[model samples]
Every structure is written in C-alpha cells, then in structure tokens.
Target: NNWVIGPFLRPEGVNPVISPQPTEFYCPMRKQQVKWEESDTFNPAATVKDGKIVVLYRAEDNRTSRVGYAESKDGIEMKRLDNPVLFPAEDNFKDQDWPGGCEDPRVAMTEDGLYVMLYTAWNRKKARLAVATSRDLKNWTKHGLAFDKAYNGRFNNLFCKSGSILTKLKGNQLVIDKVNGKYFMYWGEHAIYAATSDNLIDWYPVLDEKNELMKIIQPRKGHFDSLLTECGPPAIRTKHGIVLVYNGKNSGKTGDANYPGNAYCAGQLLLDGNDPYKVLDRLDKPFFAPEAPFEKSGQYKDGTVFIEGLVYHKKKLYLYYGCADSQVAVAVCDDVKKLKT
Candidate 1:
C-alpha cells in the first residue's frame, strides 16, 4: 500500500536533533537526594499544541523516574524545562504514583478543556494505570488508580498499565471527544483489550464470554505480533477509523517468523469507527522496527522501538518513540493521501 515511512530519526548520526539528558532534581516527596538529572531520559509522550511540540518524557534517577517537559518549534530542536513537571503525589495518589513516580504518559485534551494523561504508576509491586488532569499542561491534578473502584473493585488487585484513550484530532492538536458517547481505551500487554467509560477517569473493562479481559486483538500467530499486543500511544480517531499504533513483543515460538526473540517492535491496527473492539485490518509485519545499533541496546536491551507519542501536524504523522530505553527518536509518515483521513 506504500504507507508513508520516511525521515528516519537518527539520534547520534549525521544529524542528531534532540536527546534527553538528565538534570539535577530534588524530589519534594522523596526528600533525600538532591540535584538530579543524573539518570537517563527516554520514553516520552508527545503533545502538539500552539503549533509547537511539547514532549513530556520520563527521566530516571538512581532511584526512580519522573516526568520532564520539553518544547520544540520544529519537532526536532527542543528546549527542556529545568526540573521535572510531575512528581510523586504524597497525599492521596501516593499509593500508586510513589516509588515509580510517573512513567509513560499518553496525553490528550478532553472535551471539557481538561488535559487527560494516562500513565503508569509504578508501585514497585504492580504497575497500575493512573491518571492526572491539567487545564494548561503546566499545573496537574493527580487522580488515583484508574481501576481502583472500577467494576466494583474487580481489578484492584490485578496489575494494569498503559491506558491509551481515543481522542478527536483537530488540526495539529488532539481534543477529547466521546466515541459512541463514551471514551474508548486500548490497553493490556499479553493481549490488546478494549474498555470504555462515561467519565474519562474510571474505566470498566469489557470481558469476553469466559469473563476474562475481552481480547480486542490477540497476538497474531507466527506474525510480528505473535507474542504480545500492547497499546502504544493514545488512539487517533480519523475519518477512516480509530488508528492505534501499538507495540508488539514477539513470543519467538519458532515458526515462519524466527524473530528477534522477544524484542519489541511497532505494529499497526485499524478498528471500526463504530466499535472500538471491532478490528478492520492489521499489518502482517511491523511497520517500524529497531534497525540501528543504538535502537538495539538499552537498559531493557531487547532491541525495542517503544512508540508512545504520535501527532498529526500539517498533514504529516510524527511518531515519537523510545530507543532501546536509552535514548529518544522520531520518525515520520508524510503522505497524507495514504494516512487515514
């Protein structure tokens, strides 16, 4: 189909654009160590507002990770904030967002002018899905675990993370819009599942006949996503359908695909506009993979291309992803004709 894929981002190559470098930070909640930024900054959530790209990325310390903000006028040249934008909430949301702080956020402005962020609350035990709201992307209000009281506490004890809410894309920025009168989310690691909510906070999982988390899309047998299908970024609603670019971890069961043995790659999925769980089509092979040496080595070091940030600006698709958990990179699909309108 010749889907647009070009302008590959090379961090330390011919044209190195932006790389996340840690700065000194003294967490008010932790209250132990001071002068941070001695850690690595990778997995980022990209937001395009006011004709500029604001990157909210994860910065690691010797102890934990925090959210850091950076602004870019060209999506390449970036200027970062001095300190972290989000830290551990010590009061009410302390239980989930502690220890781990905030990690891997997917942001979108809601219909009510509230910015909704779905992030991972690393509790050191189980990674839970947490939320924080912002009106101006400067000041944030942390909401507790998403599944805390959901489904009558059905998933309170279970481990969950990565809540990618579907949003309405208006020009360059994504605004929150209800899909079928409710917000639809695509999440889960073992298999991609769908959940819906009236309010953007509390989510109720849709289960299958076996009463398990409804498998909206499972790992394609012997394909690139033969092992796991996970929601990568916030779902982008287009005229074609709900496009979700997700991360696929191969099981390496040894079939037609003798893949990289559990490496993470980026895959493509299109869902019916009416039903979030209804699949329209999917790619056999991954649309994006780790082809560079820098992309194949990191803390995880499993040849990962963890996609999290996506924005449609000026008819181009800017995909931001973590490179092997060590650095950050971006890629583009500039053909608007092929892109889902």
Candidate 2:
C-alpha cells in the first residue's frame, strides 16, 4: 500500500514568509540565480543538523549545470544559498578528461560524525559517481570521482530530454545482509540501479560487471509512469522496511505542456533491519502527488512536484521539494508511519 500528503493547503493563520533574493543569476539558460529558480530541483536529499534542515539539490545555469543548497527551519519554508556549494572541479582525474559539472546529491550521517554525500558528475563522454564530505552540513570539501574505470563513462540508454541525471543513494538500500554492512545507493542508469559500499567513501557495482544492475521497476504502458522510473530522495527507514520515495517519467519528453512529469507518488523496497541489499517489497502506486498551484503551473516543468529532500524532525517527517523546478516548497506529516498501511 502507498499514501501521500501535499499540494498542501496554505496554513490558515500563518502568513507566507519570503526569502531574500540573490543579486545575480549565475546560469540564465539553465536558470541559475541568487534567488530560488525552479524546474527539476527534484531528487532532494536532506539532513537536520544544528537545528536546521539542510538540502542538497540539482540546479542548473544555462543548462550546463551544478548542484545547489537550501535550508529551512520548519522544513516547509526554505532559503536559497547565495552561491553554489559545489560545482565541476576542473582538475583532471583518472575517471574522465573533462568536467561536466555535478548534479543530484544524497547525504548520509555516519556514526563517526562524518556526513557522506554521494553525487553524480557528467563530462563530455559519460556520467560518473563522486563523493564529498562535511563535518558540518554548512561547509563541504570535494573528494573527487568514485568509479575511475573505463567502463564507467555514460549509459546512453537512460539519457532523457529533461536532463535527469542520477539522484539519491540510501545508506541502507543495498544491504546484502547483516554481515556485509554495506551502504546502498540507487540511481537512474538506463534503469534504476543499486550499488553498495562497505565504507561510505568507496562504492562497487551491485550486479557485477557483465549484467546491468537489476531493474527493480520500470514505467508500465498507459500508466502515469509509463516512460521511465528514477530514484528520488534518500530512503527513509521505517518499521516495515526502507521507504524509498522515487519519481517517475511518463511523457516521451520533458517540458511538454500536454504531459508534465510527476514527483514521488510511489515507492520501492529495501531489506529489513541491517540487511539493506535484501529486497523486501515495493508499493505500486505513488505515495504522494502534485496538487499545489506551485506544483501544477510554473515556467519550469509544468505540473511538477518533485521531492528532493526529507528529514525526520521532532517525530515528524518534513518533506522539502521543488515546484515546477522554479521555487522550493515544503510539507510535513506528524508521523509518516501512520501513512504506511
């Protein structure tokens, strides 16, 4: 079963608080600005540290790209960072020769006081995984690319017109068993693929070199998610299993007014307890959908309510998402467990 809450009706007694806008728009074509810009700010990964909600998102400037940051106190309202937290590192590495800028960021807090961020970087030829660290969510330092192999270039099959790159990586999604103690990551590569890491720093392909990472699910014909499926924000651990909130693509191409993309309306499985790689179950219908004005209409992707980040705060799950990839919005549930019947 699946359930969702959003396109939230504006709070009755509360007034909307406006965020301060930045002075310059960094990337015009991709719509980079000092203030909030919209479109595919979807696939948000979040964490609450030092009493604030920190979200890492994929933002673009002139369509080239970079990753951006935003923060919130209650999780519904957000403030955009004045500058991008991280971008393409120009220095050459063993993985590829050029820099394609980084996109989609998933964050995890380790027991050792380290926050590990797994993200995607694209160059002239392929897309590769990368990792970075921050003692505090506010400050970050890049650690370079993860898969430095020749085969680790691009997957031509999964490329889309909407420019969707790899998204979330849940720490528990790829659990093989309690013995492996692996951290699992899920991303769109032709199909949604899973990978594992014993330590948060290094990752290895899950389905081995020859076989593609198994396709847990794909778009079904005549369905809302008929075209493709991609992992969204980091999976939230639940009593039942890891609740992975992901997005789906139905339209043949993005930016079409007739068929706009949708956010995490459904979910997939993760192993129980400590064994993340083990498959448990998957929910067929979307857990949530777009119902707000911001979600339905915008200069960015139309009718888009993308879930990029979520955090468990004060016994409630606060979900942060982008509206039409133009501005940031938020919603909350007293206890997400209640939605799990």
Candidate 3:
C-alpha cells in the first residue's frame, strides 16, 4: 500500500504555467533575432511572495536556454513575461557561453535579501555551476563560476546542474538558516551529495568519514530510480523531518509504467533534521510520474517529470517541475503533514 499527499494534477484548462508560443521574437540579451520559447519552457524554480506565486523558469529556442519569469495569483493560472529575466552575460563570461547560454536555474534568496541563482553555464565543452545576484528578478549581476580551483574544476565535466540548498524563504527569496551551525545543500545528478557553505556564494563538497566525496543518496537498482537520483527543490523543513521531493530515473530493463525507458519521476524523502545526509524516511514508490499527454510528448520523447520548486501557500503545497524536458508542470498537496508513511 502506498499513500502520499499529492502530485494532484491540475484540473482541465489550467495547467502549464509557461509554454512555447508559435511566433518569432527578438531576444535582446542573446542579441539574436530568435523565437524566445519556440522549443521548451521547463525546469522552473518557484516561490510564493506577497500572495503571488513568483516563478523563474527555463525557456529554450533554436539557439539555447534562457531564464524566463512568470507570476500567478491563484497558483494555477500564470502570466509570463515576453523576454527572459536572466540570460548569458556574454562579455566576461563568454568563454563559458558559446552554443548554449544559461540553462536549468535553481534560485534562492540570501539572508540579506539578495536573489541568488545557481544555473548551468554551457560552453559546449563543459558545464559549470554559475552564480548571479538580483535585487529584482529582472536585472541580474553575474558572479561567474560558483567554485574556486581546489573545489570544482577537478571533478568530471558533468559535475554541474541541480544545485538546491536547504533554506527558509521570504517572498520568493531563500533565507539561509544554519542547521547544526553550518549551511547545507543537496546537489548532483548521478548521485546526491552533501556540501557545506559558509557564505551563500561558495561551497565545499562534504566527504564521508572515509575521506571521499560522500554520496548521501545513491541510485537503487531495479527500482523506479535505478539509473539516477538528483536533488529537486531546495529542501524544506517539516514536522517529520527535512522534506525533499527529488527526481529519479528509471531503467528500461525494469519497466513499470508507460514510456518507462529512462524517464524522470518525483519521489519523496524525509532526512534527519540534524543531519541532512542522514536518511530518515523515504517513499519507495514515486508519488508523481508522467501520466499526462503533454508529459509524454516533448523534447525528451520517452518521458520526464523533473521537479525544481516546492512552496507552501494558503494551506497547500505546490510542486513545480518540467515535463518531458519540453514544458512546465505543476502538482499540489493540500496538507503534506498528513501524508501516510
């Protein structure tokens, strides 16, 4: 028997906060006359502030991926901006900005009220995590690569993307709260890792007692998440423990559902509040999977439901994710506290 709060699919005529429009437009930041969202609009990070749901999502065209902004009053219906809120700096960061600009953004607000975004910068050769700051989501100040030499550059070129910190948010910005006297983040694609950060800008990968990069969470063979396990939204605090709704990949060998060859699904876990690395409780079965027609049809044809944002609003929990790497998706939980373990 399996029971979880939700993945309650939105009702008819009101899903997909951002989608590709069928028109060509000019992208001032990219400076190429391109159709902004002609390809995909997925991998969004959202927060609720001042009674409006503010979402910063990824948009793709023929050129590359850029960050777009959207706002919702009822949490279902949204009004999106014509141009992206964040894009490639293209000047100082040009070495890391060829072919693809910026992709897959994970946003949080610092304690000092600065909106910090951790996104992937693609130079076609390698991908690295880059940082940017904004007072308003519209204008941004790029901070270049997120790590110094001793830290990240040594890792595999794929050691980037999906950086989520455990935090408290105030009106769409993430506020850093020290748990056990240090800041913590759960990030990685192939394996989940624990990292420590003194300041919001820099981080050091945490190693196990054995003195190696600690893999906090690993992929389970023959399960829905056999291939990969990646951090989803910035983890949130819950009465039971730290709640994380993460994305898991399926192995085609052990098919469980439709289009199940390497598809992404959303799963839940409760981590030890004192130790983010310690696993407390986990839902073995995925609470959310791609069942919608749109989810089954997109850039990633097989299927995908990649989550990135989880926010509480008006007595409900909203879960935002990407569908088949092509469009944005949303689900809700009325009361996450009451979900049966």
Candidate 4:
C-alpha cells in the first residue's frame, strides 16, 4: 500500500483543493453560464471557523440543482453567494421531479456550534441522503431526507456527482474508540457503503440488523474500483487510523469512453481504533492517478482523479478533485500522517 508523497503541481484550469492555507479555493463552473452552466463544479467543503474560510459547493443551475456558497479571508480570494444559498424545496425539490436536484455537498462543524451539510439527492430513479443546517455558515436551513430507504431503485442512477462524504469520530470506518461511540459514514452506491450516527439524524446501516457497524473497506473487485466504490468527502483522521479518500470503477468499460469506461483512483483504509467497523488495513494501489493534463483532457475523457473533498491546515492534506467530469483539481499531502503507513 504505497500512499503517495510528492509531485503536486497542476492547477492551471483549477480543480478542487479547498483549504490548506497556501491559498486554496476551487470552483471552475462556466460551461454555459446561466448562473454557472452545468457539470463539474467539484466538491469543496471547507472549514476555518470565526476567522472565515467556509466553502460548500456543488452548483448546477441550467434549470435546477443547488448548494453553493463561498467565502474566504485569505485562502485564495473568494466571496460568492449572489443567490442560491441551498435550493430544492418546491415541496421537496421539484426541478426534474422525483428527487431531482440538490447534489454533492459535504460541510461539517458540529460539537455545539452547528453547521452540518451532507448532500446528494436525485430523480430519474434514485440516490438520496440529505441534511442541511447552519447557525451561520452564511445562513442555510434545509433538513429534508437522511436515509430511511432508497438505493436499489437506482434513485437517479448513481454516478459520482462528487459530494457528500464525511468523518469525525476517533477511529475509522465507523467509530472504533471503544468499539463504536458513533460517527462514521462512507458513501457511494454499488459498492462502498456504511452508516452510523449518534446525532447526525438516525442512521444505521453498518450492515444493520442490530447494527453490524458498517464495513466495506474495498469490496467491488476486478481492479480500478472493480465496478463501483464510492465516497467523496469526509474521513481524515491520521496517526494511522482513518484516512479514507475514495472512488472506484473497473467493471470492464461501458460509456463516456476515454479508455474503456469508469476510471478513478485514490485508496487507503485502516480502522479498528477500537472497532471502527473493523477492517484494519487496505490500499493496493492508487494514491492519486489520472495523469494530469487537466486529468487527461477532460469533458469526460476517462483517465480520472475524482476526489470530492478533504482538508487540513498547518500540516497539509488538501485534495479536492473532479476532472474529466470537466475540471477542478488540487493535490497536496505534507504527510497526512504518512498516509497511514
């Protein structure tokens, strides 16, 4: 399990790498521009607190889709939010219909101050999981859906919209300080699945039955994400315990041709700080790949590098990606705890 070390340079068209101080901020929308033309806005999800950093992204407005806000004190000049604080609520999101709208957002900051966001909602089939709040990350409030059911329906036909993944426990995969206190959420359908909560809104799917505590470190096989594996935000502890940055696919090609089909890499898993769903180690290859060139000439040109968000300040560790879905990239790792040995 390698874990990556150097060679961080490639931000001409800019592709997601939210907050690490050395001035990090990414958006890169403009495909048509009606508010910001569709596709490729990339997952941001930052946090700096009172001094100001805030980022929260996932814009999609040609007709519908929301979650966009911006701010920055120094981390690379930003100020967004002319409108569209957190859309989708015409009686529960009615843009394309069904669930239709509201995509990729990760934002966190809980404990007592408040400010939680976890998004991904769809329509045309399935994909659901939502939550929103903000005592003051620039005013937001849109509770809505948070896992009761809805995954096998195809619920919008899942495809890394690049957002909604989180972490903040002690151990990994699902809290393992003393065998689960709570706080573990790995996402992505068709493969990477996990869920556990103490107060993120009643969630329990670590193999539910009574709570198996969620475990699927690296399931879908056959190389390069096998056929599916998901998670785009949230999960970054360190000291050699929880550092999961995910995305997968390798089911012998399909659509969006660029080199067969479905390609994206970045892996590492090590849990059981106490129990964290208990998968003590992982990482066969891929710490970051997609051979730069704006990730192999984007606009769906395969050869990917699709992370969604990850942030750490003084110690470095800023990887917020999305390229080939069309631009938005950044990578850094001043020893994110040695990438879990």
Please give the lDDT score at residue 93 for candidate 4: 47
Q: Which digits, one per residue and each the tens of the lDDT, describe model 3 over residues 291-320?
A: 777777745565678988776676677888
lDDT of each residue in 1-341, candidate 2, tens digit only = 43233223334332222222332445432343433323345445577666777776666542434566777787656677666666644344424313456666767675455777767766656666677788876567776555433146333222321111122223312111212455666655335566556665555555645566565556665444555666666665555555556665555444223344443343344445355455566544555566556556535344655565656666566666655555456666664443332
Q: Evaluate model 4: give its TM-score.
A: 0.30
| Alpha-carbon lDDT, every model | 0.74, 0.52, 0.73, 0.54
Worst 10 residues of 4 by lDDT: 170-179
Instruction: Compare candidates 1 and 2 on TM-score and give the better one.
Output: 1
Clashes of each: 7, 20, 1, 17
Query: What is the alpha-carbon lDDT for the whole of candidate 1?
Result: 0.74
Candidate 2 least-lDDT 10 residues: 160-169
Question: In model 4, what is the error at residue 107, expressed in angstroms?
Answer: 7.3
What's every prediction's RMSD, in angstroms?
2.7, 6.3, 3.3, 19.6
Ranking by TM-score: 1, 3, 2, 4
Pairs in clash, predicted candidate 1: 22-37, 23-36, 23-37, 24-35, 24-36, 25-36, 239-341
